[PDB]
Design an enzyme around this catalytic site. Structure first.
Site, mmCIF file in Angstrom:
data_model
loop_
_atom_site.group_PDB
_atom_site.id
_atom_site.type_symbol
_atom_site.label_atom_id
_atom_site.label_comp_id
_atom_site.label_asym_id
_atom_site.label_seq_id
_atom_site.Cartn_x
_atom_site.Cartn_y
_atom_site.Cartn_z
ATOM 1 N N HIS B 200 0.823 -1.195 0.000
ATOM 2 C CA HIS B 200 0.000 0.000 0.000
ATOM 3 C C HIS B 200 0.859 1.247 0.000
ATOM 4 C CB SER B 204 2.019 -2.505 -6.427
ATOM 5 N N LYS B 226 -14.159 -8.865 -9.637
ATOM 6 C CA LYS B 226 -13.205 -9.738 -10.296
ATOM 7 C C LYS B 226 -12.673 -10.758 -9.310
ATOM 8 N N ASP B 227 -12.326 -10.292 -8.120
ATOM 9 C CA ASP B 227 -11.815 -11.201 -7.114
ATOM 10 C C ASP B 227 -12.851 -12.248 -6.784
ATOM 11 N N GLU B 270 6.573 -33.610 -2.220
ATOM 12 C CA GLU B 270 5.248 -33.346 -2.757
ATOM 13 C C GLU B 270 5.351 -32.604 -4.076
HETATM 14 C C1 HEM Z 1 1.929 -15.483 1.349
HETATM 15 C C2 HEM Z 1 1.782 -15.509 -0.170
HETATM 16 C C3 HEM Z 1 1.551 -14.144 -0.773
HETATM 17 C C4 HEM Z 1 0.477 -13.382 -0.608
HETATM 18 C C5 HEM Z 1 -0.733 -13.675 0.253
HETATM 19 C C6 HEM Z 1 0.636 -12.280 -1.321
HETATM 20 C C7 HEM Z 1 -0.424 -11.264 -1.368
HETATM 21 C C8 HEM Z 1 -0.289 -10.324 -2.522
HETATM 22 C C9 HEM Z 1 -1.430 -9.462 -2.866
HETATM 23 C C10 HEM Z 1 -2.786 -9.462 -2.217
HETATM 24 C C11 HEM Z 1 -0.994 -8.636 -3.985
HETATM 25 C C12 HEM Z 1 -1.900 -7.636 -4.644
HETATM 26 C C13 HEM Z 1 -1.655 -7.385 -6.132
HETATM 27 C C14 HEM Z 1 -1.449 -8.622 -6.982
HETATM 28 O O1 HEM Z 1 -1.760 -9.720 -6.599
HETATM 29 O O2 HEM Z 1 -0.904 -8.510 -8.054
HETATM 30 C C15 HEM Z 1 0.418 -9.034 -4.237
HETATM 31 C C16 HEM Z 1 1.249 -8.415 -5.307
HETATM 32 C C17 HEM Z 1 2.719 -8.693 -5.286
HETATM 33 N N1 HEM Z 1 3.379 -9.702 -4.551
HETATM 34 FE FE1 HEM Z 1 2.613 -11.007 -3.295
HETATM 35 N N2 HEM Z 1 1.832 -12.340 -2.069
HETATM 36 C C18 HEM Z 1 2.392 -13.547 -1.611
HETATM 37 C C19 HEM Z 1 3.659 -14.179 -2.027
HETATM 38 C C20 HEM Z 1 4.511 -13.285 -2.864
HETATM 39 C C21 HEM Z 1 5.637 -13.741 -3.395
HETATM 40 C C22 HEM Z 1 6.091 -15.183 -3.227
HETATM 41 C C23 HEM Z 1 6.238 -12.737 -4.042
HETATM 42 C C24 HEM Z 1 7.521 -12.774 -4.851
HETATM 43 C C25 HEM Z 1 8.705 -13.321 -4.080
HETATM 44 C C26 HEM Z 1 5.470 -11.662 -3.949
HETATM 45 C C27 HEM Z 1 5.899 -10.339 -4.494
HETATM 46 C C28 HEM Z 1 4.719 -9.536 -4.925
HETATM 47 C C29 HEM Z 1 4.831 -8.489 -5.734
HETATM 48 C C30 HEM Z 1 6.162 -8.001 -6.273
HETATM 49 C C31 HEM Z 1 3.622 -7.965 -5.963
HETATM 50 C C32 HEM Z 1 3.328 -6.741 -6.838
HETATM 51 C C33 HEM Z 1 2.577 -7.198 -8.082
HETATM 52 C C34 HEM Z 1 2.307 -6.155 -9.138
HETATM 53 O O3 HEM Z 1 1.840 -5.068 -8.822
HETATM 54 O O4 HEM Z 1 2.469 -6.434 -10.320
HETATM 55 N N3 HEM Z 1 4.362 -11.899 -3.101
HETATM 56 N N4 HEM Z 1 0.723 -10.024 -3.359
#
Ligand code: HEM
Ligand code: HEM
Ligand code: HEM
Ligand code: HEM
Lengths: 48, 378, 51, 111, 60, 49, 105, 75, 378, 51
Positions: B200, B204, B226-227, B270
Site C-alpha cells: 500500500h 505497486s 473480479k476477485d 510433494e
Molecule cells: C503469502 C503468499 C503471498 C500473498 C498472500 C501475497 C499477497 C499479494 C497481494 C494481495 C498482492 C496484490 C496485487 C497482486 O496480486 O498482483 C500481491 C502483489 C505482489 N506480490 Fe505477493 N503475495 C504472496 C507471495 C509473494 C511472493 C512469493 C512474491 C515474490 C517473491 C510476492 C511479491 C509480490 C509483488 C512483487 C507484488 C506486486 C505485483 C504487481 O503489482 O504487479 N508476493 N501479493
C-alpha cells in the site's frame, strides 16, 4: 475411505450445476460491472 | 461526515481494500493473491477445524488418522481435501512467482524479500507442517529430511540431534514439528499484513508497466467483483480435485502406515515440494545441495539485484520471453527430472538442468537482458 | 560501480573508518566467544578455564 | 454523499417543517416572479407558450395550496429514486467516482 | 409482465432492499428442498445398487 | 471559441431496448435494471444456499 | 523501426509487432522503465510533449483493457519517430553524469 | 500514498461515459471473440511453443532413453 | 533525511513507541501494560517452548506431564513457573482494571469495550487454555464447567454435547479446548495491536486528568526507561514466586491425577479465576448466574455508560474514592467469600456481596456519583 | 434523555421507518428459519416438509 464416494459423489453433481449457473451469473455480473468502462470514449483534444 | 472516510479502523479499511485507488489497467495476474489468503484462511480454517478433531499423538498417528479419517466423515473430505488444497496453495505459489517474473515486478525490494520470507517460510512451514501426518512416505522420508538436519561441519551431529531431538527423529520430533506447524502459519499471517502495508505504501506495478496515476479505480467494484470471480474459480479448483478424485494427486506410500523398519524404494517430495529433491540429489556435496536450495530463491533475490533492462515489461522483450517460458521449461523440466528415480539418463539430465538454472537465470537470463539492451538501440 | 565510492575521497573515508572497523569487529568476535563459550576457542581461555 | 444522500435523505426523511418552509419559499419567490414587470411579462409569454393557460394566483396557489408531503415521500420516490441525473464539475474531477461508484452512489445501501 | 417481473419484481420485489432479501431467502427454501429432491433423483436413476436392496434384502 | 465538441455512437455496444430516439426508457429502465437485478439476486439466493 | 530495426528495433517493430510496443503505437522514449533519473527527467519534459505522451499512454491503457490494438495501419509509422526525451533525457544523462561527475570529484 | 487530488497533472483532455444498464452484455460475443481471440493467442503462439516442443521431445525422448535402458540383453 | 522520520515501517515505529509524544504528567499506572504484553510474549514464549515439548495427549496427560515435569528439567521451572506467571498476568489484569477505575479512564469507549473483549477473552481463553493440564482439580472441575456448557433452554443438552463433543467431557474436549488455547492467544495479540492503534488515535488520558497537550515527552527516555524498570520489577515478581516457592499458590488437587470416578470435595477456580465461582454458586438460577457473570464486565461497560460526574479524576472526589477502595473491599471480599466452601454464614455473606456489586457499583457507585455532583456546587 | 429523539419530529421519523422496520425484521426472522430449519418452526412447514 470413500463411502461418500457415493454420498460425496452426490454433492459433486450439484457443484456441476452451481458453477454452470453461478459461473455464468458471476461472469455476467462482472461484465455487468465492467461493461461501461469497456466502451469509454475519452478525448485528447489539445487546445489548438 | 462519511464514516467510510471517518471511522479510524475503517480509515485503514477504505485505505486498504475499499477507498483504495488502484491501477485501472490491472490484469488477471492478480487473482492468486486473495486466493492464497483465502487459501491461507481456509488453510487455517480447515487446519483449525482439522486440529479440532485431529490429534497428533505417537500411537495415535495412523490411529487418530483413522479416527480423523476412517472414523471421520468429511474428515475424509475436509482432511484429504484441504490437504490437497495445500498443494493448490503451492500451485498458485509457484505460479505467482511466475507472475512477478514475466511481470519482472522485482522493482519493489521489500516486497520481493518479503515474499522470500514467504518463500522458505512456506517451504519448511509446509514441510514440518506437512510431515505431521507422519506417514510411511513422510516416515522413512522423515529419516530423510531428518538426515537433512545434520549437514554442518562439527554441528549437525549435535544439531540433527537438537533438531531431531536426539539420536534420531522421534516422537520428540512429533511434538516438535507438530507445534512448529502450529506456530508458523501465524507467522505467515503477520508477515502478510506486513508485506501488505509495504505494498500500500508504494502502491505497486501494473501489467502495462506505465505509471499508473493515469488510471485508477477502487477494487470495488472492479477488482473486487473480479476477485469474487477468481474465488469461484478456486472453489472450482479445490472443490473440484477434492470433489471428484480426491486421491488423484496422492502417493500410496502415505496411506502406508509408518513402519520404522521399512525404508521402501521411493522417497519423493510433494508436487509442492517436488522440484527440490531432484535439485537436492543433483549435486554430489552437502552445502552444494543446500546453498543451491536457498540459492534458488536467494538466486531470485540476486535476480532483482541482477535486474538489468531499461524496460520493465518483458512483454516488449520477446527474446526475454524466450528465456522466460524457456526458464519454465527448465523448471517443470526439473519436475519430471525429479519425476524419475535415480537413473542413467537423468544423471546428466538434471546435471545440465542446474547449469540452466544457473544459466537460464543467472547467466542466460541476465546475459539475455544485456543482449536485449544492446538490440534496444533506444 | 565501485568507482562511485572508489576515489581518494571515499578512500580517505575508509582510512577514517578503519580503526573503528577493527573495534566493532572485535565486538562481534568476542561476543561470539562469551555467548558461545565454544569449546574450540574456550580451551585457550586460562582461569576462564572452567575445570 | 451529501447530494444523493441528501436526496436519499430526501427520498426518505421528509418532515413537514421544511415542506412548509419551501412552501413559503415558493410563496415569496412566487411574488418575485409575479412581482416584477418583465418577470411577469415573460411569465405570461412562456405561460401560454407552454401552458396556453396561466396558473392563476389561486391555481398555482392551489396545486401549491394542495401541496402534500406524502407525495413528497412517494412522488419523490416516483421521479427521484434509482436514477442517473446530471452532475458536472469543472476541473480536475478525480473525486468524481465511477458511474460504477458515483452512480453506484446513485443507489442507496443506507438501505 | 416480464416487464413487471424486471420492473414490478424490481418494484414490487427487487426495489425495496429488504424485499429483495426476503425474496432471496424465500427462495432459499424452495430451491433448497427442491434441488435436494431432483438431485436425489439424479443419483437415483444413476444406480439402484443399494437401499433398494431392502426389498431384495427381503425387507424383514 | 470553446464550444465545438461532440460525442460518439453507442450503437455497437447498445443493447436493443435503447435503439430508438423514438421512445422513453421510462418503460425500459425498470426492465433493464430488472434483468440485471434478477441475475444478481440469482447469484444472492443461490449463494445463500 | 526499419528492417534492421524492424528485426531489432523490430523487437520493437516487427517483433514489437510481436512484443507490441510500436505496433501498439507506443512512444519509444516512453518505454524506459520509470527510474528517478527517468522521474525528474520527465519532470523537466516539454509541455506539448507532456500532453502528447499522455494521450499516447492513456490510449495504450485503453486498448490494453480492450485487449485490442489500433489498425495495423493505425499501428505506428515505422522509423519516423522523434526521439522525444533523448535530447532532454540524454541531457539529463549528462546531468546525473554531472552531479555524478563532481560527485566523483 | 495516492488516494486522489494530490494525484497528478492532466491538462486539456476529455471523457465520455455511459450508464451500465444501457449496453448489451455480449455484443458480437462469439463474433468478436474471433481471431481476435486468435489474435492474442495465435499472436503469441510462435513465441510460446518451442520450449514445450523440447519438452514433449524430452519426456518422450528420455522416456525412451531410460525405458529402453531398462531392457536386458544376451550373453 | 532522518530515517527515524523516514522509514515507513519505522514511520509506524517512531509513531508508535519512539517519536510518540505522550503526557509528561504520566503516572506509574502505566507499567502493567507492557508487563502484560511482555507477560503475553513470555506467555507465548514459554507456552511455545512449553508446547515444544509438551504433548497434550489423553494417555499422555499426567504422563507427558511427568515427561513435561518429572522428566522435564526446568520444565519444572518453566512449567510450574510461567504457569504461575499466568496468574501474575491475571494479577496485573484485575489491577489494571482498577487502573482505569480509580482513573475513571472510561472516557474512551472503543478502548473500554476493547479490553472487554480482552476481558471475557482472557477469562475463558485461560479457562480452556488453563484446563489443558486436565488435572484432577481441572478434571472433576472439568465436569464442572463441562456442566456449564448446558445452560440454555432446549439447547445446552445438544449444546454441552457440541461443546463437550458429546455425552460428556472427553478426549473430544481434550483436542477441542487444547486447540482452542492454541488459537486464542493469537486472537489476544491482534486484538492488542487493535486496541493499541485505537489508543494512538486519541492519544489517551492522564492521571492528572487535564488536557495533556500542555506537557509531553517521548517514552524514551522517560516512559521507556521507566518501563525497563517495571520490567525488572516483574522479573522480581515472576522470577520470585517462581524462583523461591513455586508451589506456593497451587492447589494439591492439580498434582492429583485425574481419576474419572473421583469427584472430590473442593472444586474451586484459580486465584485468577477465583472471584467468579463464588459469584456463580451465589444465585439459585442458571442465567442469573451467567448473566451476572458477563454482567460484571458488561456491568463495567454500563459503568462507562453510567459515567456521571462532571470531573474525571476521583482524586478530587473523595467520597467516590470511598466507593472505590470500598468496592474493592467488595471484591477481594468476594474472593475470601469464595474462599470458603458452601457454608451457613457465607450464604448470606456473598448473598449481600452481590447486592454490593449491584449497589457498590451499579447503585451505590452511581448514586455516589450523583451525590458528589450535588456536593460539587461548581 | 429520550426527549432528545422524543418529539413529534423524530416521532414522525419513526412513523416513516416503521414499515421498513417490519421488513428488515422479517428478514432476520426468516433467516433464522432457513438457516436453522429448527424443528420447532420446521414442523409447520408444508412441502418444505422433508419427510
Ligand atoms: C503469502 C503468499 C503471498 C500473498 C498472500 C501475497 C499477497 C499479494 C497481494 C494481495 C498482492 C496484490 C496485487 C497482486 O496480486 O498482483 C500481491 C502483489 C505482489 N506480490 Fe505477493 N503475495 C504472496 C507471495 C509473494 C511472493 C512469493 C512474491 C515474490 C517473491 C510476492 C511479491 C509480490 C509483488 C512483487 C507484488 C506486486 C505485483 C504487481 O503489482 O504487479 N508476493 N501479493
Ligand atoms: C494454522 C492453520 C493450520 C492448521 C491448524 C493446520 C493443522 C494441520 C493438521 C492438524 C494436519 C494433520 C491432519 C491432516 O493431515 O489432515 C495438517 C496437514 C497439512 N496441512 Fe496444515 N495446518 C494449518 C495451516 C496450513 C498451511 C498454511 C499449510 C500450507 C498450505 C498447510 C498445508 C498442510 C499440509 C501440507 C498438511 C499435510 C498433508 C495432508 O493433508 O495430509 N496447513 N495441518
Ligand atoms: C491484554 C491486556 C492488556 C494490554 C496488553 C494492554 C496494553 C495497554 C498498554 C500498552 C497501555 C499503555 C499505557 C498504560 O499502560 O497506561 C494501556 C493503557 C490503557 N488500557 Fe490497556 N491493556 C490490556 C488490558 C486492558 C484492560 C483490561 C483495560 C480496561 C478494561 C484496559 C483499558 C486501558 C486504558 C483505558 C488505558 C489508558 C490508560 C491511561 O492513559 O491512563 N486495557 N494498555
Ligand atoms: C499461544 C501461547 C500459549 C501456548 C502455546 C500455551 C500452551 C499451553 C500448554 C500446552 C499447557 C499445558 C502444559 C502445562 O500445563 O504446563 C498450558 C498451561 C497453561 N497456560 Fe498456556 N498457552 C499459551 C498462552 C497462555 C496464555 C495467554 C495464558 C494466560 C495467561 C496461559 C495460561 C496457562 C495456564 C493457566 C495454563 C494451565 C496451568 C498450568 O500451567 O499448569 N497460557 N499452556
Amino acid at each position: 475411505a470413500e463411502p461418500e464416494h457415493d454420498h460425496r459423489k452426490r454433492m459433486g453433481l450439484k457443484m456441476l450445476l452451481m458453477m454452470g449457473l453461478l459461473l455464468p451469473l458471476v461472469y455476467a455480473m462482472k461484465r455487468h460491472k465492467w461493461s461501461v468502462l469497456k466502451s469509454r470514449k475519452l478525448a485528447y483534444r489539445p487546445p489548438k | 461526515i462519511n464514516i467510510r472516510k471517518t471511522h479510524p479502523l475503517m480509515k485503514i479499511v477504505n485505505n486498504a481494500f475499499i477507498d483504495l485507488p488502484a491501477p485501472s489497467n490491472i490484469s488477471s495476474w492478480w487473482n492468486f493473491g486473495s486466493l492464497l489468503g483465502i487459501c491461507l484462511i481456509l488453510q487455517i480454517l480447515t487446519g483449525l477445524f482439522l486440529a479440532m478433531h485431529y490429534t497428533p499423538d505417537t500411537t495415535t498417528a495412523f490411529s487418530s488418522v483413522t479416527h480423523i479419517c476412517r472414523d471421520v466423515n468429511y474428515g475424509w473430505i475436509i482432511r484429504y481435501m484441504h490437504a490437497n488444497g495445500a498443494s493448490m496453495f503451492f500451485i498458485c505459489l509457484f505460479m505467482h512467482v511466475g507472475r512477478g517474473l514475466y511481470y519482472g515486478s522485482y522493482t519493489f525490494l521489500e516486497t520481493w524479500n518479503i515474499g522470500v520470507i514467504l518463500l522458505f517460510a512456506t517451504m519448511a512451514t509446509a514441510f514440518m507442517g506437512y510431515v505431521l501426518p507422519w506417514g510411511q512416505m513422510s516416515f522413512w522420508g522423515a529419516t530423510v529430511i531428518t538426515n537433512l538436519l545434520s549437514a554442518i561441519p562439527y554441528i549437525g551431529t549435535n544439531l540433527v540431534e537438537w533438531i531431531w531431538g536426539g539420536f534420531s527423529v522421534d516422537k520428540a520430533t512429533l511434538t516438535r514439528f507438530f507445534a512448529f506447524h502450529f506456530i508458523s502459519p501465524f507467522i505467515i499471517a503477520a508477515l502478510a499484513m506486513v508485506h501488505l502495508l509495504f505494498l500500500h505504501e508504494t502502491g505497486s506495478n501494473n501489467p502495462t508497466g506505465i505509471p499508473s496515476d493515469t488510471d485508477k479505480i477502487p477494487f470495488h467494484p472492479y477488482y473486487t467483483i473480479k476477485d469474487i470471480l477468481g474465488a469461484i474459480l478456486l472453489i472450482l479448483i479445490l472443490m473440484l480435485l477434492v470433489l471428484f478424485t480426491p486421491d488423484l494427486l496422492g502417493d500410496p506410500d502415505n496411506y502406508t502406515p509408518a513402519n520404522p523398519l521399512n525404508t521402501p524404494p521411493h522417497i519423493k517430495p510433494e508436487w509442492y515440494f517436488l522440484f527440490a529433491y531432484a535439485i537436492l540429489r543433483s549435486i554430489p556435496n552437502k552445502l552444494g545441495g543446500v546453498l543451491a536450495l536457498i540459492l534458488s530463491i536467494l538466486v531470485l533475490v540476486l535476480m532483482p539485484l541482477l535486474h538489468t533492462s531499461k524496460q520493465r515489461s518483458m512483454m516488449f522483450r520477446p527474446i526475454s520471453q524466450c528465456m522466460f517460458w524457456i526458464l519454465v521449461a527448465d523448471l517443470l523440466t526439473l519436475t519430471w527430472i525429479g519425476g524419475q528415480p535415480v537413473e542413467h539418463p537423468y544423471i546428466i539430465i538434471g546435471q545440465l538442468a542446474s547449469i540452466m538454472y544457473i544459466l537460464l537465470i543467472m547467466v542466460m537470463m541476465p546475459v539475455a537482458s544485456i543482449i536485449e539492451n544492446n538490440l534496444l538501440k533506444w | 560501480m565501485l568507482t562511485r565510492f572508489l576515489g581518494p575521497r571515499y578512500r580517505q573515508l575508509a582510512r577514517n573508518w578503519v580503526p573503528t572497523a577493527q573495534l566493532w569487529g572485535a565486538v562481534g568476535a568476542v561476543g561470539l566467544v562469551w555467548a558461545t563459550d565454544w569449546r574450540l576457542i574456550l580451551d585457550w581461555v586460562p582461569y576462564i578455564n572452567g575445570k | 454523499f451529501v447530494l444523493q444522500g441528501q436526496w436519499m435523505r430526501l427520498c426518505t426523511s421528509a418532515t413537514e417543517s421544511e415542506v412548509v418552509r419551501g412552501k413559503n419559499l415558493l410563496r415569496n419567490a412566487l411574488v418575485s416572479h409575479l412581482d416584477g414587470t418583465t418577470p411577469v411579462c415573460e411569465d405570461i409569454g412562456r405561460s401560454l407558450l407552454t401552458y396556453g393557460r396561466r396558473i392563476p394566483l389561486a391555481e398555482w396557489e392551489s396545486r401549491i395550496a394542495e401541496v402534500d408531503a406524502r407525495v413528497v415521500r412517494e412522488v419523490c420516490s416516483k421521479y427521484f429514486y434509482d436514477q442517473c441525473p446530471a452532475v458536472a464539475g469543472f476541473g480536475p474531477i478525480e473525486q468524481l467516482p465511477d458511474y460504477n461508484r458515483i452512480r453506484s452512489g446513485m443507489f442507496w445501501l443506507r438501505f | 409482465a416480464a416487464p413487471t417481473l424486471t420492473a414490478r419484481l424490481y418494484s414490487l420485489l427487487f426495489r425495496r432492499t429488504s424485499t429483495f432479501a426476503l425474496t432471496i431467502v424465500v427462495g432459499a427454501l424452495f430451491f433448497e428442498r427442491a434441488f435436494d429432491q431432483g438431485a436425489d433423483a439424479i443419483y437415483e436413476h444413476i444406480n439402484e445398487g443399494k437401499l433398494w436392496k431392502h426389498i431384495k434384502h427381503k425387507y424383514e | 471559441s470553446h464550444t465545438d465538441i461532440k460525442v460518439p455512437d453507442f450503437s455497437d455496444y447498445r443493447r436493443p431496448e435503447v435503439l430508438d430516439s423514438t421512445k422513453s426508457s421510462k418503460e425500459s429502465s425498470e426492465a433493464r435494471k430488472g434483468f440485471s437485478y434478477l441475475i444478481t439476486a440469482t447469484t444472492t439466493v443461490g449463494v445463500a444456499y | 523501426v526499419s528492417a534492421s530495426s524492424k528485426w531489432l528495433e523490430g523487437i520493437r517493430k516487427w517483433y514489437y509487432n510481436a512484443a507490441g510496443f510500436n505496433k501498439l503505437g507506443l512512444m519509444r522514449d516512453d518505454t524506459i522503465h520509470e527510474n528517478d533519473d527517468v522521474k525528474e527527467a520527465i519532470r523537466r519534459l516539454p509541455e506539448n510533449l507532456y500532453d502528447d505522451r499522455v494521450f499516447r499512454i492513456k490510449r495504450a491503457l485503453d486498448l490494453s483493457m480492450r485487449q485490442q490494438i489500433l489498425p495495423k495501419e493505425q499501428w505506428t509509422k515505422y522509423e519516423e519517430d522523434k526521439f522525444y526525451l533523448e535530447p532532454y533525457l540524454k541531457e539529463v544523462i549528462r546531468e546525473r553524469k554531472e552531479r555524478e561527475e563532481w560527485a566523483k570529484k | 500514498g495516492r488516494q486522489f487530488g494530490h494525484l497528478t497533472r492532466v491538462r486539456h483532455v476529455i471523457t465520455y461515459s455511459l450508464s451500465p444498464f444501457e449496453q448489451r452484455a455480449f455484443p458480437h460475443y462469439f463474433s468478436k471473440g474471433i481471431p481476435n481471440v486468435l489474435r492474442r493467442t495465435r499472436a503469441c503462439i510462435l513465441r510460446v511453443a518451442p520450449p514445450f516442443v523440447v519438452f514433449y521431445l524430452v519426456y518422450t525422448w528420455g522416456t525412451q532413453e531410460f525405458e529402453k535402458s531398462k531392457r536386458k540383453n544376451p550373453a
